Design a protein around this ligand. Structure first.
Ligand code: NI
Length: 341
């Protein structure tokens, strides 16, 4: 059965609730972004209205085959009426097409559902600035102070500098980057850009990237592996066995692999700086784990919430244990006492 934190009171609406069958009372199903834990349950036989971004709607049609008549894309930053209720979609600074949803209830309550997000000070100058928000449905993935990681810009700088150095020392080195969902496209695009190459990938991944409205994408990616010196592979293949097997397939064109795994957080973050990160190596293969996050750090999350000053917070992540729930509730109270709301 559908959990309470996926339901929007005072409406016929649910958020990211496609794996519970026909939800009793639901006249519109919103989808925040195209990640499988959130779309789980959607398929070509779905017959209810789905509300989402243009980009999410491209992926629903092309990848899941949802029929067009049930896909309702909305523009961002624009007041829209859905089944008699004003809503706005905001950029969530997560993966391509990811949104936060503002609901303006008929009784006067305003609710923000963040979906998955990476909080940013720029959000303090969106349409959120313009009225009070009573209830916040919050992505609490990294809601604990140990969760530190660098800016996306610092991480991309590390990756660009590492790749350009290795390939300039050895022009016969191949760069490989892991992927298993949309998001984090800057990692492989920034590295291919410094090397003067397109990124090579499977037909299935090329198809996915052609749904994302990235400017000038036809100039940046390709299915011809032979012409490319940055290859994308499934995340499961980014290990010594998988990468050895891939190098065999390249027909003696290359004699060294440098590979990147963009993880979220890893406990090496508590001690080590981004400057100081070192790879795991075996022979002519080196693997870097780089902390490129599409979710808020603890400090970024705290700044956002202390700015927004909501009356009530409903977590949407880490809700399955009493210890987690109690931990999160303590931090919410600290924040509220420190700021005075
Ligand atoms: Ni996500």
């Amino acid at each position: 059965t559908c959990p309470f934190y996926k339901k929007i009171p005072g409406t016929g609406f649910t958020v990211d609730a496609f794996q519970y069958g026909v939800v009793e009372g639901c006249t519109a199903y919103f989808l925040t972004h195209f990640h499988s834990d959130h779309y789980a349950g959607l398929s070509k036989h779905f017959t209810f209205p789905v509300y989402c971004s243009e980009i999410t709607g491209n992926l629903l049609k092309n990848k899941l085959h949802v029929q067009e008549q049930y896909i309702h894309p909305l523009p961002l930053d624009t007041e829209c009426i859905v089944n008699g209720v004003k809503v706005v979609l905001l950029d969530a600074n997560h993966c391509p097409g990811a949104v936060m949803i503002l609901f303006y209830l008929p009784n006067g309550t305003v609710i923000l559902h963040t979906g998955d997000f990476r909080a940013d000070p720029s959000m303090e100058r969106s349409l959120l600035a313009d009225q009070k928000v009573h209830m916040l449905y919050l992505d609490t993935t990294y809601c604990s102070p140990e969760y530190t990681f660098p800016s996306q810009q610092e991480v991309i700088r590390f990756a660009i500098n590492t790749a350009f150095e290795a390939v300039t020392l050895n022009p016969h080195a191949l760069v490989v980057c892991g992927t298993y969902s949309i998001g984090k496209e800057k990692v492989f695009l920034a590295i291919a850009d410094v090397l003067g190459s397109k990124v090579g990938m499977s037909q299935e991944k090329y198809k996915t990237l052609q749904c994302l409205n990235i400017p000038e994408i036809n100039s940046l990616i390709t299915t011809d592996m032979c012409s490319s010196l940055v290859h994308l592979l499934p995340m499961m293949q980014i290990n010594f066995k998988g990468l050895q097997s891939h190098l065999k397939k390249c027909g003696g064109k290359y004699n060294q692999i440098l590979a990147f795994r963009p993880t979220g957080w890893t406990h090496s973050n508590k001690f080590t700086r981004i400057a100081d990160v070192i790879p795991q190596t075996k022979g002519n293969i080196s693997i870097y784990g780089i902390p490129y996050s599409e979710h808020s750090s603890y400090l970024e999350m705290k700044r956002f919430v202390q700015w927004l000053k909501p009356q009530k917070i409903i977590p949407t992540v880490n809700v399955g244990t009493w210890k987690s729930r109690s931990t999160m509730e303590k931090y919410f109270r600290e924040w509220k006492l420190e700021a005075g709301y």
